[PDB]
Design a protein around this ligand. Sequence first.
Ligand code: V8I
Ligand code: ZN
Length: 257
Amino acid sequence: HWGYGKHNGPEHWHKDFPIAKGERQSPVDIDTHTAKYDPSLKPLSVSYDQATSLRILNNGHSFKVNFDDSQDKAVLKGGPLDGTYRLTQFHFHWGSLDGQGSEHTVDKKKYAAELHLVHWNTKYGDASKASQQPDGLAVLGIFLKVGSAKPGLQKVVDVLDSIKTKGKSADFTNFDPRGLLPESLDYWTYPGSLTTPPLNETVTWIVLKEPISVSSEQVLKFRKLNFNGEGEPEELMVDNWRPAQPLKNRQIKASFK
Ligand SMILES: NS(=O)(=O)c1cc(C(=O)O)c(Cl)cc1Cl
Ligand SMILES: [Zn+2]
């Protein structure tokens, strides 16, 4: 029932998900002048060499690639994290135009899209249990700007016409998420939430400073997806982003400079 339209969009979500007006909601605006360099952050470790992708799916609100997380294959450690977080899926948020699409903003600037690599704390055994714990999830967020093509994204864009409508899935094995990362692992970090219902306040956000560049042709392919199921009125899947939420009593910490 929830979505991104006038009648079911982010301003409505609080009726079914009252935590929408909570104390640690995401996304937020990252005020780069107010964020404090934190010398106690350990190096961030993105270890994706053994990642095992499975399937790609149109879920009616985004498209998602899932991974085999039955063992420690692709993990995130270090930075603000304690222990080991396993990669379970990635998805994206994007706009109708190149100047909007991202969920996080940087001094109020919106990027064309945002990649979320979703990970869960292995001390909780499974992703369901992890998603109910204050330190259960970690999302590595990566901004996309339009410019030069991103080669490591092209395999994703080329399969999207096989999952046009809600509920469609396709095989998506042997995909390497290392091809989605920028050069720098400089980041901002803060405690927050899922940006989609049920908006659980269980996420350590790690947002990279350096965007990746993607071509206009790559982002245009994202905008050909549909929110609707096959044989319903066609509604293009665009502007599937939640706007910035109040920071409230939270500090954003920077890993750099
Ligand atoms: N946008 S987000 O906050 O990364 C997020 C989205 C989803 C979703 O698939 O919609 C899930 Cl299950 C978990 C997280 Cl953590
Ligand atoms: Zn997301």
